[PDB]
Write a protein that binds this ligand. Structure first.
Ligand SMILES: Cc1nn(C)cc1Nc1nc(N)c2c(C#N)c(N3CCC[C@H]3C)n(C)c2n1
Ligand SMILES: [Cl-]
Ligand SMILES: [Cl-]
Length: 257
């Protein structure tokens, strides 16, 4: 059995605890759940094989409760590397963004959308490699080479793409690209640009009107800001795709550790 030493946090659907093995002292992260939902999460977790996606060990159920076993991320979360109102050194932000894109390209290539990318769900191993965690909202958007549109609102309001608040159905990939742009903003400014990307929200209107002399944008060097101008495009069909992010000037800029 296992000893639950502390809560690491709450996911989109449940709890996550630091569990220490009573016989081994091996420290792991365990998600303990009370349905159709967890059946789906486990199945997605089983598909995952990438250096920038969290390691799933396996699962155990006992009546009113089911247990999900994951690689403990010894570096904790990206959230804890963001200094409020400051962010982090631009070279650490670019490296983490390179790794986030590697993880998202992997997921999209196996037809999976994460749907809740934010710094809380991005963990760091002992060598500060980024791992995309929390598959509680993840779903299939491509099967047998056929795309299906999403038609369900979920995620986290400051990270969600505007089409998810406006369209009955929308493409999965541009939504995950948007959330990656808000994560890049967070890493470079230590502040979220808006509560939600709605015309009711003045900070979002100011961005559409290009007032980049306001915060958080004025904290952001012109090169990464140019990338953010192509990611945070309201119309998903005009938003930059990952293959063109890989071509961006800042994305390809050599920066010093
Ligand atoms: C060693 C360590 N110190 N601290 C403060 C955090 C860790 N390491 C760690 N390792 C994980 N494996 C997860 C994990 C998952 N899975 C998780 N989460 C919280 C709820 C959302 C989810 C991403 N969190 C927060 C995780 N934290
Ligand atoms: Cl933040
Ligand atoms: Cl090309």
């Amino acid at each position: 059995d296992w000893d639950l030493v502390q809560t690491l946090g709450e996911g989109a659907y449940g709890e996550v605890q630091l569990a220490v093995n009573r016989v081994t002292e091996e420290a792991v992260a365990v998600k303990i759940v009370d349905p159709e939902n967890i059946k789906k999460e486990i199945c997605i977790l089983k598909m995952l094989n990438h250096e920038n996606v969290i390691k799933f060990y396996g699962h155990r159920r006992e009546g009113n409760i089911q247990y999900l076993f994951m690689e403990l991320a010894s570096g904790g979360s990206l959230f804890d590397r963001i200094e409020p109102d400051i962010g982090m050194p631009e070279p650490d932000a670019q490296r983490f963004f390179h790794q986030l894109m590697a993880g998202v390209v992997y997921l999209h290539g196996i037809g999976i959308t994460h749907r809740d990318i934010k710094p809380h769900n991005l963990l760091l191993d002992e060598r500060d490699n980024l791992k995309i965690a929390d598959y509680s909202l993840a779903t299939v958007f491509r099967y047998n080479n056929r795309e299906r549109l999403l038609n369900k609102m979920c995620g986290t309001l400051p990270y969600v793409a505007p089409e998810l608040l406006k369209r009955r159905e929308f493409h999965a990939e541009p939504v995950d690209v948007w959330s990656c742009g808000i994560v890049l903003t967070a890493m470079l400014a230590g502040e979220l640009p808006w509560d939600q990307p709605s015309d009711s929200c003045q900070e979002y209107s100011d961005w559409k009107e290009k007032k980049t002399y306001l915060n958080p944008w004025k904290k952001i060097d012109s090169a990464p800001l140019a990338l953010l101008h192509k990611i945070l495009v309201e119309n998903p069909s005009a938003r930059i795709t990952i293959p063109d992010i890989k071509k961006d000037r800042w994305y390809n800029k050599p920066l010093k550790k």
